[PDB]
């Protein structure tokens, strides 16, 4: 069931913004680890005396990395005279965010038809305002409302080059890395209480619940009209044998925040080969692979979707496979991206649901909790 | 002239500690960019609820990267019951340092015979105490005094495995990168006033002035008895045609601090080839190369030390060459390591002064200021 109840016209995920202590080092690490190209900058060299912001791109995926300069560089400025290219930025907010949460996502940005209208309608429907609509160079409008914790939902709308005041990165400094990642599939929040979080976000967006089919969590997925903007949310389940990963997140993050970003690959086997080659030379690490019993049991579940060779390719890369009633999901999870056991990345590829591919084809892999446990127990038996 | 006036027995540079917002991302970037191996850790996985610390090594060079966790993880602790492996660490100090200065060196650590004695003698001779001597697992003693700005001089002494409480990094997560860097040659501070800075540091160490032969700076070099611990200091020269790079540093750093680390390579040509291959894929960028007039003029100055081919290798890597009356210096400078125009790295290799090689052989390249300007002007002519 999809009532298509969006209260304003939503297009696609636009970008994800990380708030960092040093944007340069995080961006260079992410670029190498994920195969993303440096494509735009806003920093001292572009006249921005407030913040350093570096944009990485892979296909349609946009990762922005921002850190504050010394406030003394911009002490003479006022908001009317700011040199910040993202006028919602605040030194105190950014330092407080990073000192409280460590490295993490500050903004989940979606493109809309009219960011001023989206902001107005959202706030009229219960959204907590974060930054009012601001028109940049009469070309782009940005506005922000609170999503959960200190994460904001950022609306961006264009009249007709990432943002004004950003400069394209010289091709010498712009190496064309590409490991196959193409777009953001979903962005997942961890909260202490799922019910109130869903009521709040569904309240001001009109996003609807995307239906699913002792893991430590309850979850639900909010979706836009065409189900291309997907915002799952988790809460912990307490009193379990193994401590809930959601609760550990909430403790180390100092509360609610963004838990994982799922990045769609046009060839998850190539992406994982390339990322795994770089794990120990500056890139990202992956969770430990499931036991071979998991891939032995892969035949009876998806033996009609993947050949035995393609199943062999999954086992040597540690890829997980799940299936709903409409499609098949290939997925794998990185270890946490930074010092704290908080944010991580998921790499995914979806098989099926062609009409273009419909959003969420194959689900989100919730079945892989049970299959993992079953495999683990029956691998010990063997 | 070397009066050998050290007030306590100093051995060698031991390590450099960076205070970071996220130690993981900075360390992974530096590892790939410089060819340093992950060799030790102290973090949540080792029981440290206070800070994450990751050690990179290349030869005898030791880079430590540290960032604070949420203070809430260790709220029950007191200094007697701390789980921090570096007991001088302070959450508030670290967040204040990083919010004030951005990514940079907090500690220049030297090995001494007796860190408690070095601390006592230093403070008795005017050193401002930072962290008193603390004996770790009855095996290592660390103490800290102020050096300049918020940078500390850290004394470490061993009775007879980096520090207690650190664990060796599993060889799977430990890729044996090596681009030829072997040790720290010198560590350079920027201050507003050179005179008082030298008087202070020479006052409590007994280090002596290491003699040199409109660049925007005045400088001097303090040295230990065998001139293997080398601590240059710069001050700006104001009212110049081009703004002093020292003054720009002081402005963007919010005051005095560590300006550059010079890393000795056992083969600067291999090091630069390897680092330059990685500049645009996560590594470090280098300052723009001198014009070919510079390398044309290289024959008449060092044509007796380097062949024409080895001079050719210098021009294609952008390496600078200088000479004193005892040896020859090969050097090159990176662009700043992080967001701010503050800290950078120098790669060096020294030729001559064999007896082992004596410290500072060839000087520090101060002659390369004039040679660069001369080359620049006479390249425009050609
Ligand atoms: C098997 N499995 C898993 O093991 N971990 C895991 C990772 C690192 C450390 C420990 C556990 C996951 O996080 C994980 C996450 C998902 C997931 O993406 C997801 C959604 O997107 C939204 C609906 C709720 C949901 O479940 C699926 C399977 C997962
Ligand atoms: C030619 N040259 C240079 O161009 N820069 C530069 C770098 C980036 C941006 C602009 C200028 C330098 O920093 C630089 C530094 C040194 C140096 O190391 C040094 C010492 O170690 C101690 C004594 C004082 C001193 O000079 C030598 C030559 C240098
Ligand atoms: Co997911
Ligand atoms: Co130097």
Chain B nearest CA to A174, separation (Å): 7
Considering only CA atoms, which residue is closest to atom 25 of ligand 1? A366
Report the distance separating Cα B50 and Cα B92, nearest Å: 12
Query: Considering CB atoms only, which of A21, A251, A340 is closest to B20?
Result: A21
Q: Which ligand number lies closest to the CA of residue A319?
A: 1
DSSP B85: S
Q: Which ligand number lies closest to the CA of residue B366?
A: 2
Tokens of A186: 């979903």
Would you give the end-to-end CA distance of chain B in angstroms? 43
Residue with tokens 């019910």: A195
Tokens of A264: 């769609």
Indicate whether residue B148 lines ligand 2 (CB < 6 A).
Answer: no
Q: Within 13 Å and on the Cβ side, how many CA atoms surround B111? A: 16
Would you give the end-to-end CA distance of chain A in angstroms? 43
Q: Ligand 4 center to residue B162 CA distance, Å?
A: 27
Pocket-testing residue among A320, A364, A367, A376, ligand 1, by greatest number of atoms within 8 A of Cβ: A364
Report the distance separating Cα B351 and Cα A340, nearest Å: 45
Query: Considering CB atoms only, which of B99, B103, B285 is closest to A25?
Result: B103
Chain A nearest CA to B88, separation (Å): 19
- Closest to A334 (Cα-Cα) out of A323, A325, A343: A343
Considering only CA atoms, which residue is closest to atom 7 of ligand 1? A333
Indicate whether residue A287 lines ligand 1 (CB < 6 A).
Answer: yes
Q: What technique determined this structure? A: X-ray
Indicate whether residue A367 lines ligand 1 (CB < 6 A).
Answer: no
Query: Considering CB atoms only, which of A21, A44, A337 is closest to B21?
Result: A21
Considering only CA atoms, which residue is closest to atom 11 of ligand 2? B245
Report the distance separating Cα B231 and Cα B360, nearest Å: 11
Q: Which ligand number lies closest to the CA of residue B318?
A: 2
Q: Ligand 4 center to residue A153 CA distance, Å?
A: 47
Indicate whether residue A219 lines ligand 1 (CB < 6 A).
Answer: yes
> E strands along chain A, which residues?
10-19, 37-42, 51-58, 61-68, 104-112, 129-136, 140-148, 151-158, 167-168, 181-190, 208-210, 217-223, 230-236, 257-265, 320-323, 327-333, 344-352
Indicate whether residue A232 lines ligand 1 (CB < 6 A).
Answer: yes
What residues have CB less than 8 Å from A181, skipping those under 6 apart?
A: A34, A35, A36, A58, A59, A61, A263, A264, A265, A271, A347
Radius of gyration of chain B (CA): 21
Q: Ligand 2 center to residue B290 CA distance, Å?
A: 14
> How wide is the angle at C-alpha A145 spanned by C-alphas A141 and A147, nearest 5°?
130
**Resolution stated for this PDB structure, in Å:** 1.7
* Interchain proximity A20–B24, CB inside 8 Å: no
Q: Is the CB of residue A310 less than 8 Å from the CB of residue A199?
A: no
């Amino acid at each position: 069931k999809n009532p298509k109840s969006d209260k304003f016209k939503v297009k696609r995920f636009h970008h994800i913004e990380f708030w960092c202590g040093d944007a340069t080092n995080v961006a260079r690490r992410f670029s190498w680890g994920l195969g993303m190209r440096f494509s735009a900058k806003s920093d001292l060299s572009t006249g921005n005396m407030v913040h350093a912001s570096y944009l990485l791109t892979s296909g349609d995926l946009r990762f922005l990395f921002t850190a504050p300069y010394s406030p003394s560089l911009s002490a003479g400025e006022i908001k009317p005279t700011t040199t910040a290219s993202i006028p919602s930025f605040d030194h105190g907010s950014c330092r407080s965010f990073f000192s409280s949460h460590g490295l993490g996502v500050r903004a989940v940005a979606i493109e809309v038809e009219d960011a001023e209208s989206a902001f107005s309608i959202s706030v009229a429907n219960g959204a907590i305002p974060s930054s009012p609509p601001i028109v940049l160079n009469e070309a782009v409008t940005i506005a922000e409302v609170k999503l959960y914790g200190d994460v904001v939902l950022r609306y961006v709308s264009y009249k007709a080059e990432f943002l004004p005041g950003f400069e394209r990165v010289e091709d010498a400094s712009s190496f064309p890395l590409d490991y196959g990642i193409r777009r953001l599939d979903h962005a997942v929040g961890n909260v202490p209480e799922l019910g109130p979080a869903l009521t709040y976000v569904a309240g001001f967006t009109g996003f609807h619940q995307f239906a699913e089919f002792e893991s430590g969590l309850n979850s639900a997925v909010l979706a836009s009209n065409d189900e291309m903007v997907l915002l799952p949310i988790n809460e912990p389940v307490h009193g379990t044998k193994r401590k809930s990963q959601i609760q550990t997140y909430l403790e180390h993050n100092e509360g609610a925040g963004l838990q994982h970003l799922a990045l769609m690959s046009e060839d998850i086997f190539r992406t994982l080969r390339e990322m795994r080659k770089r794990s120990s030379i500056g890139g990202f690490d992956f969770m430990p692979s499931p036991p071979p019993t998991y891939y032995q049991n892969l035949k009876k579940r998806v033996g009609d979707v993947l050949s035995d060779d393609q199943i062999k390719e999954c086992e040597e890369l540690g890829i997980l496979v799940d299936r709903d009633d409409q499609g098949t999901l290939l997925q794998i999870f990185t270890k946490p991206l930074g010092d704290r056991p908080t944010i991580f990345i998921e790499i995914i590829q979806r098989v099926g649901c062609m009409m273009y591919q419909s959003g969420g084809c194959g689900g989100f892999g919730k079945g892989n909790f049970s299959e993992l446990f079953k495999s683990i127990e029956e691998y010990e038996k063997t």
